[PDB]
Write the structure tokens for this entry.
Amino acid sequence: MSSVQTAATSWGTVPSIRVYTANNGKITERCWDGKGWYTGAFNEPGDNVSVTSWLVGSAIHIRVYASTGTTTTEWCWDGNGWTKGAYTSDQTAATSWGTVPSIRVYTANNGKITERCWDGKGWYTGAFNEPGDNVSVTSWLVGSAIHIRVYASTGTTTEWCWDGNGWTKGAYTSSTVPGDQTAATSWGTVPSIRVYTANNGKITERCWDGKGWYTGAFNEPGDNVSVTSWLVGSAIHIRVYASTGTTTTEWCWDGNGWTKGAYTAT
Ligand SMILES: CO[C@@H]1O[C@@H](C)[C@@H](O)[C@@H](O)[C@@H]1O
Ligand SMILES: CO[C@@H]1O[C@@H](C)[C@@H](O)[C@@H](O)[C@@H]1O
Ligand SMILES: CO[C@@H]1O[C@@H](C)[C@@H](O)[C@@H](O)[C@@H]1O
Ligand SMILES: CO[C@@H]1O[C@@H](C)[C@@H](O)[C@@H](O)[C@@H]1O
Ligand SMILES: CO[C@@H]1O[C@@H](C)[C@@H](O)[C@@H](O)[C@@H]1O
Ligand SMILES: CO[C@@H]1O[C@@H](C)[C@@H](O)[C@@H](O)[C@@H]1O
């Protein structure tokens, strides 16, 4: 493959970060807990990976969706070892909210994106069905109400929007190429959204802050992209993991331009 494929999540304000990399059929994990990157416990087969996580109090819960073929296995971290989850259904994208939690997993397969849903009481097939060869997702809560944005790429990236009772076509536009791969993050209540697109070896960034999409400052090489972000008070921090070949570079936004991070594969 022209590059490894990554997925990233983060929690708290330290923060802790976990980056999962699929390389030649194996997924491994690099970890940050404030004091240097290190190799994590996670090791499972897969050509494709997505991740979501949530806190209950101080306890992290992580779900990693590892795909080989149309067989996607969910791996669970709930404080004591990676365990096999109940998910059944590929390129995937995952999001979660609340503390139950609710999870949504989107799978692009043979040009179609479909959705699997967990609301505490088993997996079911969701209402979402849209064309796409590649999918990314982000979501946010506004009080009790969930908002989901799915970025479906075919031939053009279309944004699909859930805001309480149905999927609607969003205002997102970009300049894309066939085969493009995206990653998305969001923060606050407006919200702000950032969508990163890898198009023929270049990653660019489209931005929403409440009143239209604009082209962001991020511009770095890569065939594959993942992203995570966290707030410290009102200040956003973003980490973008850009891969070309087996080289993954972390790019950092901490309020004052994009800078190179300490991330290594080691
Ligand atoms: C303490 O263990 C580390 O952190 C956990 C939350 C997991 O990411 C695990 O794979 C890693 O080795
Ligand atoms: C309690 O069940 C476990 O956690 C849920 C949040 C889901 O990830 C499910 O597939 C997994 O088996
Ligand atoms: C209530 O409907 C379910 O949850 C929503 C948040 C969406 O994920 C929808 O596609 C799904 O069927
Ligand atoms: C209000 O506008 C809708 O929600 C925003 C958060 C964006 O996702 C935008 O593209 C979409 O049309
Ligand atoms: C104000 O600048 C915009 O927002 C920042 C949080 C970054 O996403 C940057 O690339 C973008 O152009
Ligand atoms: C302070 O260190 C910077 O931020 C951390 C949260 C990590 O993303 C690290 O790789 C980066 O160099």
Q: What stands out?
A: Residues 194, 205, 207, 216-218, 236, 253 surround methyl alpha-L-fucopyranoside (ligand 5) (CB under 6 Å). The first strand starts at residue 5 and ends at 11. Residues 127 and 181 are 23 Å apart (CA to CA). The domain at 1-266 is CATH 2.120.10.70 (Neuraminidase).
